[PDB]
């Protein structure tokens, strides 16, 4: 129902914005991918971004499959939860990390305490509020 834009802290200061309709999967991110020719992010290639609400840092890498006009043009990559991300993960040797188990519940050290054990849909709603309260929610748009 909604598109969320989140700001992830960038190594050395500043932020990089990512858009997603699956905020609960942010904790499984393994990279942020950008098109190599995208002027907005080229200088960030090789630096790292911190996953909101965690102490996990992931690579900002380049991949030609990224569409500069989709979202912010910076794509969070979660190989375990999306088939397109899985293909990017294979090209870059990313390790799939799942934060949603087979029963549909959130699980994992990377998942914030308040979200563990919740079913995916309830976690999606709560994750948005945790991001909002922590200062990571840049914007929310309705479909």
From Swiss-Prot:
Organism phylogeny: Bacteria, Thermotogati, Deinococcota, Deinococci, Thermales
Protein's organism: Thermus thermophilus
Top-rank taxon: Bacteria
Similarity comment: Belongs to the class-I aminoacyl-tRNA synthetase family. ValS type 1 subfamily.
UniProt note: domains: ValRS has two distinct active sites: one for aminoacylation and one for editing. The misactivated threonine is translocated from the active site to the editing site. The C-terminal coiled-coil domain is crucial for aminoacylation activity.
Function according to Swiss-Prot or TrEMBL: Catalyzes the attachment of valine to tRNA(Val). As ValRS can inadvertently accommodate and process structurally similar amino acids such as threonine, to avoid such errors, it has a 'posttransfer' editing activity that hydrolyzes mischarged Thr-tRNA(Val) in a tRNA-dependent manner.
Annotated phenotype, changing residue 85 to A: Strong decrease in posttransfer editing activity. No change in aminoacylation activity
Record note on what altering residue 82 to A does: No change in aminoacylation and posttransfer editing activities
Name the UniProt record assigns to this protein: Valine--tRNA ligase
Full-sequence range covered: 195 to 337 of 862
Subunit structure: Monomer.
Cellular localisation: Cytoplasm
């Amino acid at each position: 129902g909604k598109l969320y834009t989140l700001r992830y802290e960038v190594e050395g200061g500043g932020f990089i914005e990512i858009a997603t309709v699956r905020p609960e999967t942010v904790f499984a991110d393994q990279a942020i991918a950008v098109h190599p020719e995208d002027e907005r992010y080229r200088h960030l290639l090789g630096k790292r971004a911190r996953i909101p609400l965690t102490e996990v840092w992931i690579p900002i890498l380049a991949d030609p499959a990224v569409e500069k006009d989709f979202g912010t043009g910076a794509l969070k990559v979660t190989p375990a939860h999306d088939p397109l991300d899985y293909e990017i993960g294979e090209r870059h040797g990313l390790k799939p990390v799942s934060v949603i188990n087979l029963e549909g519940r959130m699980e994992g050290e990377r998942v914030p305490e308040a979200l563990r054990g919740l079913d995916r849909f309830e976690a999606r709603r709560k994750a948005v509020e945790l991001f909002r309260e922590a200062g990571h929610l840049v914007k929310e748009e309705d479909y």
